[PDB]
Amino acid sequence: MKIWSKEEVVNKLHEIKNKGYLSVPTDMFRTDDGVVGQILERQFGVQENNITLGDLGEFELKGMRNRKAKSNLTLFHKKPVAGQTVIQIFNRFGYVKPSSRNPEVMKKKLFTTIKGGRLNNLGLTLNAKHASEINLYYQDEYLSTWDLNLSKIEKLVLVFAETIGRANSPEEQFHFTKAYMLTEINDITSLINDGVLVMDLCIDQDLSKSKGPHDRGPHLRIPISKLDKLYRNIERLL
DNA sequence: GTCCGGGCG
DNA sequence: CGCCCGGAC
């Protein structure tokens, strides 16, 4: 592994921006929301991976399309350490509904965002005692517990991309024009309980096939506009 | 299974 | 917010 210095990342970010609109290699394309991150990684010599640690060693690289109304930032994924498994949660709380990409394909899905401080429409809520104990409830019924390690996200290099082309098309292109370094992470307990940091469940299954469901891992997520509640130091790198 | 990379109206 | 995907090993 290469552990990057800040100077080397800043130099690399400038190089990337200066290239302008980058394409999706034919070998990489797979109708994938995450291609923005795949491209940003490849520009940094980071190959596709499922390693837990920050992919630049001292930093973790995150790429996002510069949408006017942005999706939340996915920080990392983590299964519960205790209680109901995610598939058990899917079995119970999942629902049968056509694929949103191909309406001729029926899925069972659980795509839900769970927050502390309130119940969502499925009745699900979080209560954090500490970062090491975040509890999932259905109403007053305990379900599962997460113990989250945030070492991968201690230092983020967040990079925003302007786009041309239709979203998730082969012809989509990305110009990385802005980047921030976020460091000095706060404790997440309050952030869970105040509804700032959220957990997404993202599980689905093609019910015409005899595959099991695809659990993409419970996502810890944060809106970009609340990153200042998670990190006390934000630096404009690009 | 358990992580990685990210979306929409 | 309710709701949503593509991968790796």
Closest-lying nucleotide for A81 based on CA to C1': B2
Q: SS3 for A18?
A: helix
Q: A199 with A191: CB under 8 angstroms?
A: no
Is there a binding annotation on residue A60? yes
Owner of token pair 């945030």: A150
The alpha carbons of chain A give a radius of gyration, in whole angstroms, of 19
In the Cβ-directed half-sphere of A159, how many Cα atoms lie within 13 Å? 28
Phi-psi region of A66 (alpha: psi -120 to 50; beta: other; left: phi over 0): beta
Distance (Å, whole) CA A143 – CA A120: 15
Q: Which residue is nearest to nucleotide C2 (CA to C1')?
A: A112
Strand C contact at CB of residue A79, distance < 7 A: no
Nearest to A76 by CA among A45, A58, A52, A57: A52
Q: Which residue is nearest to nucleotide B7 (CA to C1')?
A: A33
Nearest to A203 by CA among A107, A70, A119, A121: A107
Sheet arrangement for strand A173-185: A60-65, A156-164, A173-185, A231-236
Specify the amino acid at residue A46: V
Nearest to A219 by CA among A119, A78, A125, A85: A78
Superfamily of domain A1-70+149-186+224-238: MvaI/BcnI restriction endonuclease, catalytic domain (3.40.210.20)
Burial of A161 (0-12, 13-18, 19+ CB in 10 A): buried
Tokens found for residue A136: 């999932």
CB atoms closer than 10 angstroms to residue A77: 16
Could you state, in order of their start, the residue ranges of all structural domains in chain A? 1-70+149-186+224-238, 71-148+187-223
Q: What is the DSSP letter of A21?
A: S
Just give the CATH number of A71-148+187-223. 3.30.70.3570
Q: Which residue is nearest to nucleotide C9 (CA to C1')?
A: A50
CB atoms closer than 10 angstroms to residue A169: 11
Query: How, if at all, do strands A156-164 and A60-65 pair?
Result: parallel
Owner of token pair 């499925």: A122
Residue A37 phi, psi dihedral angles, 5° rounding: -75, -35
Q: A129 with A147: CB under 8 angstroms?
A: no
Owner of token pair 């837990």: A52
Q: SS3 for A60?
A: strand
Vertex A28 angle, CA A27 and A29, to 5°: 100
Q: 3-state SS string over A127-159? A: EEEECCEEEEEECCEEEEEECCCCHHHCCEEEE
- What is the H or E stretch that residue A182 is in? strand A173-185
Helices (H) and strands (E) in chain A, counts: 5, 14
> Method of determination?
X-ray
Strand C contact at CB of residue A77, distance < 7 A: no
> Angle A6-18/A35-43 helices, nearest 10 degrees?
110
